[PDB]
A paper describes a structure:
The subsequent sucrose gradient had two distinct particle bands; in the 20% fraction (empty capsids, EC), and in the 25% fraction (genome containing “full” capsids, FC). Cryoelectron microscopy (cryo-EM) micrographs revealed that the consistently high genome count of the FC population (in the range of >1015 genome particles of each segment) is indeed due to the presence of almost exclusively full, genome-packaging particles. This number was multiple logs lower in case of the EC capsids, which displayed an overwhelmingly large proportion of empty capsids. The interior of the FC was filled with density attributed to the ssDNA genome. The slight amount of genome-like density of EC capsid interior confirmed the genome quantification and EM results, namely that this population is heterogenous and is composed of EC1, EC2 and FC capsids (detailed by Fig. S7). The EC, EC1, EC2 and the ORF1-VLPs monomer lacked two N-terminally ordered residues as well as the unusually elongated C-terminal tail of the FC population, making Gln366 the last ordered residue. The AdSDV fivefold channel displayed two distinct conformation states i.e., either an “empty” for the EC fractions and the vpORF1-VLPs, or “filled” as observed in the FC population. In contrast, both EC populations displayed DE loops pointing inwards, narrowing the pore from 16.0 Å (FC) to 10.1 Å, with Tyr159 and Ile152 retracted underneath the DE loop peak.
Residue numbers in the entry:
A (entry chain A), B (entry chain A): 49 to 153, 158 to 366
C (entry chain A): 102 to 153, 158 to 366
D (entry chain A): 49 to 101
The structure:
């Protein structure tokens, strides 16, 4: 009988999200950096640098100066999101220079080696790791391992890309590893021992990394003393081998022939935040999983960086 | 020459938003309320209630208890947005009951008047207003004007919809009023004297509302003592007449025949937040306009609620 | 959410379906729940009117029974005794379907001779797993499906997580490893309410005369024709909340968000 | 008027079986037996055995 405009017998209506909301933010970090193999101290040496993409360094947490609204967006979107899934992490190194330190007498001058390249090793085929102590240590310029190289005179175990200056090196990862409608519970990405999604089932006893690195996840969540959630998933295995930046090993009269690279390293980490529903539901933690991370009191802690995953034909 | 995978001579690349990002949040507020014309005090009287949609009450600021993540979403999205545009404001009143207070002896009993209706007046055709003192005053249950009715025995000046119980009354507004790529500068919608977008060019001298109510906007922004922005737009005019809820005026033996309505009032305010760019740009205020609002020291302040806008055929 | 589908709220409501179930549980090694059909019929909507003092009841045909799903909220059901399972007396303090501030409930609205039906899919299990039978004689046992939320006070166990891990004694000599993937379920709190209508005195009081019909489809997988105690290997303990707790809180999670790949 | 989901004016409904239910069980008995006509006593004799079906 009601004659008004846009009036209808009510259906079943409650308008609240029910968790169906999702936001895609891209945290992106772009740096023109000094990659220096010349110096004798503090990760300036011939030692091949390491890009700790296995770690949450994608935030640029190596330094606070590199914060940007993408982090701040992420941070906020984490407060208002119950869970997040990482989509694709796009790393692009641009080489703006290749520079050699030449010796004359004594002191050195730097000359342009355009015509040489920057080496990007994947450190596949080896079981190796990244020590992580402080977020500073995450700096891919100073991050090193002793007695380490991309070049072995005996068995050269590294698959090494080779980059001319204005040639660009891009890579992309799929962090979509999760399924069964699970997510990752948000953090601000403010720790260096948290790691990217994907399962490197290797974990040290010294720093138990936990169930998030195994295909079959089992974990609990306090989320209050009264209730506890059982988070169980199947997440495909990932390898994420150690990615190094190196100069060529070239034997000068004196010693290894020293270079320094001026690069720009661009990151885009696609993050789909699944927003807290329009009504309080603390139990959405049920679907989230703790960020994959390595725990323990250890000051220095070793990121697994497994070479690869073999495949079997059925 | 560079042989690596996914390598190409760089193009012009900086990855930062440049303001192109936008988020659509819907602040939605859903209340099962007591709409009471029976009482003798404090907006419980025969006086027709007013839905102050002209005001920012869409937040539900009438009471803090009605806060929800949509506000909290909005609040955050306002911190990280340089400007916002309102899209469509969907108001839906559901009537779950129509109740009359019958007199017996003395005391009253309430009986179901299913078969009568709730009146929604638009108070068009009249120049009338809404006094707003406190956000509480925004409550559409208690919000009233003295010597006021939807029924004049002489000239009945109101276009009054009439709502059966389980019939629903819905309305929608277009707050897209702005153009020339202008936005509104965000607020948390935490004030009752801020008003919806759209131009009611009427403003009192007592409380200058300002240029946002005129088609041709002119205003300045401090945004630092060093720089100032000139915000100038053309925004189509809006009317937004006073929307009242009323009971029928029915003369019992004693006096006006008293009812009370149990309704649910649902709001959806579509808000497209335009996110702060990935790099600091304080001058995006240049494109935003102050939320339309009525200023001044006035404790009580009158919302224009113009009836309509005449049209001329060229 | 509870095993009240048996009608365990009262013994008087036992019927051959239970007795059938009971027996079929003795002779079945495992059971899978199929579909649980709940139908509320409203035969009356009645208001208590005040006169003077004492009350009379008048027919409010023209008002409705509210069925809330209590979605969008994290809420629970305290369960102490099977009696407490009675949907007539089962309540939470300071609780309503109506909030003057944010109304968080999706509430169906039922005329008298209109009927409210719902159906659940308890087929949650897979990998050829079942549930190990019980007579459904406990109130703290719960329906299949995974609400991963469990209190520390009453550990509910692995049956509420997608990835199940549990062991079975089934004799001191052998033990079974039961491991599954069961899709997640929400099963939000389902309330019956009257409208909140403010009379002169106080909230305006109603009473509903309803009929509530339940059908719980149960496929019993019968004990094989030869003794095989190890079929427990495929069964999983009925999902339940353990612990010494007298009162115990059923999770009743609102919902489950979904992510687009 | 009732707007809820899966709601309809009731028909005549009582859900009880009314005896319409039936179960087929097969009792099956399988034996590797000694059928002996040799012995001199207790049904072991030349006497033809009987299957008391």
């Amino acid at each position: 009988e009601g004659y008004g405009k846009h009036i209808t017998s009510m259906h079943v209506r409650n308008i609240f999200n029910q968790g169906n909301q999702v936001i895609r933010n891209i945290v992106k970090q772009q740096r023109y950096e000094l990659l220096d193999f010349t110096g004798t101290e503090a990760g300036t040496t011939n030692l091949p640098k390491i890009i700790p993409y296995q770690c949450i360094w994608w935030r640029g947490l190596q330094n606070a100066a590199n914060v940007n609204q993408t982090i701040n967006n992420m941070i906020a979107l984490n407060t208002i999101s119950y869970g997040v899934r990482f989509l694709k992490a796009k790393l692009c190194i641009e080489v703006y220079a290749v520079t050699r330190k030449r010796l004359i007498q004594s002191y050195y001058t730097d000359d342009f080696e355009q015509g040489q390249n920057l080496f990007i090793g994947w450190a596949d085929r080896k079981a190796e790791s990244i020590p992580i102590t402080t977020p500073a240590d995450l700096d891919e310029t100073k991050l090193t391992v002793a007695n380490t190289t991309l070049f072995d005179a005996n068995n050269d175990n590294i698959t090494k890309e080779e980059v001319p200056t204005r040639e660009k090196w891009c890579h992309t990862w799929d962090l979509d590893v999760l399924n069964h409608n699970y997510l990752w519970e948000p953090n601000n990405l403010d720790s260096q021992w948290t790691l990217i999604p994907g399962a490197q089932a290797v974990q040290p006893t010294a720093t138990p990394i936990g169930p998030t690195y195994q295909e079959i996840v089992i974990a609990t969540k306090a989320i209050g003393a009264n209730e506890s959630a059982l988070v169980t998933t199947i997440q495909d295995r990932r390898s994420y081998p150690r990615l190094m930046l190196s100069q060529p090993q070239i034997k000068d009269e004196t010693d290894t022939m020293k270079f320094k690279y001026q690069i720009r390293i661009s990151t885009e980490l696609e993050m789909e935040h699944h927003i807290k529903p329009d009504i309080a539901n603390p139990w959405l933690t049920r679907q989230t999983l703790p960020l994959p991370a390595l725990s323990g009191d250890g000051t220095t802690r070793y990121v697994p960086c497994v070479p690869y995953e073999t495949h079997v034909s059925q």
